[PDB]
From a paper:
Zinc-finger antiviral protein ([name]), also known as poly(ADP-ribose) polymerase 13 ([name]), is an antiviral factor that selectively targets viral RNA for degradation. [name] selectively binds CpG dinucleotides through its N-terminal RNA-binding domain, which consists of four zinc fingers. [name] also contains a central region that consists of a fifth zinc finger and two WWE domains. Through structural and biochemical studies, we found that the fifth zinc finger and tandem WWEs of [name] combine into a single integrated domain that binds to poly(ADP-ribose) (PAR), a cellular polynucleotide.
PAR binding is mediated by the second WWE module of [name] and likely involves specific recognition of an adenosine diphosphate-containing unit of PAR. Structural and biochemical analyses revealed that [name]-CD binds to PAR through the second WWE module. Our data indicate that this [name] pocket is analogous the isoADPr-binding sites found in other WWE domains. Specifically, we find that the [name] pocket is configured to accommodate an adenosine diphosphate unit, which is an internal repeating unit of PAR. A single ADP unit without the additional phosphoribose moiety of isoADPr is also found at the free termini of a PAR polymer or in proteins conjugated to a single (mono) ADP-ribose unit (MARylation). However, the [name] pocket does not fully recapitulate all the structural features of the prototype isoADPr pocket in RNF146, suggesting that there may be differences in binding mode. Moreover, since the composite central domain fold of [name] has an extended electropositive cleft, we speculate that its ADP pocket may be part of a more extensive binding site for a PAR polymer. Further studies are needed to determine if the [name] pocket has preference for terminal or internal ADP units of PAR. Mutation of the PAR binding site in [name] abrogates the interaction in vitro and diminishes [name] activity against a CpG-rich HIV-1 reporter virus and murine leukemia virus.
Residue numbers in the entry: 509 to 623, 630 to 696
């Protein structure tokens, strides 16, 4: 499994070293692939802070230049392990990952769904979890759209205009993860 263990972050994982899940001190783990071994980056929090900004697809960390779109760096491929999505666990599970869904508007900027769309980030995330190849119809004002997960785009069904859609976590710094563990 590539899923960061929630129990290890909170009160503790009873499975100890035999847990099938990943045990890490953060709810995210950023890694590069060198040979046949995934290797931890050094400045995970800086990378995560860049990832969680939807208007940022480039992140220079160390000598590395990271491209989030492609999930590679220099030439090497990267990945972000994660706790489960927050819609998959009760609200008590404070270490779940909260995924925000955004669309890019006329004026070039990223607007959160719900901020007006009749779908919000929890809606879309829930559908995306229960069906990642889905197409979500929705309405905004008097206009009607379809959001294609597998394409990560929204299309106005009348004019067929397309707009990008992006899914990124909310950021938590390590100091706040430590506060949550108190
Ligand atoms: N998911 C959304 N949620 C809220 N508002 C949205 C969303 N997506 C687009 N909009 C906004 O609603 C308006 C509609 O834009 P689009 O539906 O993306 O595309 P389009 O219908 O081609 O643009 C409208 C224009 O096209 C012409 O047919 C007509 O003259 C109209 O002025 C724009 O202001 C756009 O920024
Ligand atoms: Zn565990």
């Amino acid at each position: 499994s590539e899923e960061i263990c929630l129990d290890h972050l909170c009160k503790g994982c009873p499975l100890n070293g035999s847990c099938s899940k990943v045990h890490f001190h953060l709810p995210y783990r950023w890694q590069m692939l060198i040979g046949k071994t995934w290797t931890d980056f050094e400045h995970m929090e800086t990378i995560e802070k860049g990832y969680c900004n939807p208007g940022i697809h480039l992140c220079s960390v160390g000598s590395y230049t990271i491209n989030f779109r492609v999930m590679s760096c220099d030439s090497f491929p990267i990945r972000r392990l994660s706790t489960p999505s927050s819609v998959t666990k009760p609200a008590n599970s404070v270490f779940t990952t909260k995924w925000i869904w955004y669309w890019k508007n006329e004026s070039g900027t990223w607007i959160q769904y719900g901020e007006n769309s009749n779908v919000d980030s929890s809606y879309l995330e829930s559908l995306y979890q229960s069906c990642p190849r889905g197409v979500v119809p929705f309405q905004a004002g008097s206009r009607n759209y379809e959001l294609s997960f597998q394409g990560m785009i929204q299309t106005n069904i009348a004019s067929k205009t397309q707009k990008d859609v992006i899914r990124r976590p909310t950021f938590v710094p390590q100091w706040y993860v430590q506060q949550m563990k108190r």
